[PDB]
């Protein structure tokens, strides 16, 4: 084995909430904490010394580079050369005093879209030398807090600080649609597994679903605190939402029941589903990276970092997790099965 499982336990932290107010501690099925495609643990394998708080992180496909968004720039790190201590590239994106908030790779790996605390989204050509700026999208919203790319690669969705969701046609750099609804900043975003619906979370305490074909708001979920992060299960049915209250809420899509998960002491700043959908991670201001079984939230592993964990990503094969830190670095983990 090399590392072996060892069971721990906690006061009940995972609850099923039925249509009424009723809250029952989840009795875990036999494959809650162990099974095919379920991690046994995670091993830190690199530290990427950005030197500014890492508010955004993404990993290439194939996994060989990591992109860290800090203050004004994205740094590019070659993790397939374990001895490297500095970036191989740096992408100067915003004013040196403005934070990057999101960075997304197009499905084919040739292009990076970057947004943050500024009106412009920068589009980067990653085909060699020399990553270069290919285009800019200029919004009239003061900031971008989150990005999502359509599965066909044609459109970029930007969560604006005024609560609007901008829809950008990437080919001609035109804002083709705007989803209006959120009455404070839109903080996070994902697309449904069938690609037909958008899901967004807000600093107005709502989660909203939107029809991508018609453009109209479909559902609204009102919470008692602000939403910072969200993720749609890639095999369907479940939406996980990270709350300022410290909860993760796992909403049963279209249905009145949910799971409430309590393993953070502060705001849940980021979350991400594994590509297989069977598990996800959440990160907190309390320094924890939590791994959770889908949907009911059995705790698969926890890693306590040195500082707030602001952002995360998981590689396309579910083999690596990258986290961005308030200690001005990113961490690369290998997921051990």
């Amino acid at each position: 084995d090399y590392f072996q499982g060892a069971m721990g336990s906690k006061p009940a932290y995972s609850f099923h909430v039925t249509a009424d107010g009723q809250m029952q501690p989840v009795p875990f099925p036999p494959d809650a904490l162990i099974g095919p495609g379920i991690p046994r643990h995670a091993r830190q394998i690199n530290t990427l010394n950005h030197g500014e708080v890492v508010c955004a992180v993404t990993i290439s496909n194939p996994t060989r580079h990591v992109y860290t968004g800090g203050k004004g720039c994205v740094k590019v790190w070659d993790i397939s050369h374990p001895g490297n201590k500095s970036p191989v590239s740096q992408l100067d994106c915003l004013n040196r005093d403005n934070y990057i908030r999101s960075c997304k790779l197009l499905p084919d790996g040739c292009t990076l879209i970057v947004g943050g605390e500024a009106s412009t989204l920068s589009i980067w050509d990653l085909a060699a030398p020399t990553p270069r700026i290919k285009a800019e999208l200029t919004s009239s919203a003061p900031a971008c807090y989150a990005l999502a790319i359509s599965p066909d690669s044609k459109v970029c969705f930007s969560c604006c600080s005024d609560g609007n969701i901008a829809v950008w046609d990437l080919h001609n750099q035109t804002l083709v649609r705007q989803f209006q609804g959120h009455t404070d900043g839109a903080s996070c975003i994902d697309i449904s597994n069938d690609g037909t619906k958008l899901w967004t979370g807000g600093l107005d305490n709502t989660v909203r679903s939107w029809d991508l074909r018609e453009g109209r708001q479909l559902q609204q979920h009102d919470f008692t605190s602000q939403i910072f992060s969200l993720g749609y299960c890639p095999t369907g049915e479940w939406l996980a939402v990270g709350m300022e209250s410290s909860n993760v809420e796992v909403l049963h899509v279209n249905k009145p029941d949910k799971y409430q998960l309590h393993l953070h002491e502060s705001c849940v700043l980021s979350l991400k589903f594994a590509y297989c959908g069977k598990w996800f991670v959440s990160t907190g201001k309390d320094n924890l990276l939590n791994a959770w079984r889908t949907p009911y939230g059995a705790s698969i592993f926890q890693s306590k970092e040195s500082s707030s964990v602001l952002s995360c990503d998981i590689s396309v094969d579910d083999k690596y997790i990258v986290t961005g830190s308030g200690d001005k670095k990113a961490t690369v983990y290998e997921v051990i099965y």
């Binding site: 708080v53 934070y99 605390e117 404070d184 600093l203 707030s308």
Partner: peptide, 9 residues
């Protein structure tokens, strides 16, 4: 509305 400085400090 939240800037990163608000979130951190």
């Amino acid at each position: 509305m939240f800037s990163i400085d608000n979130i951190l400090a």
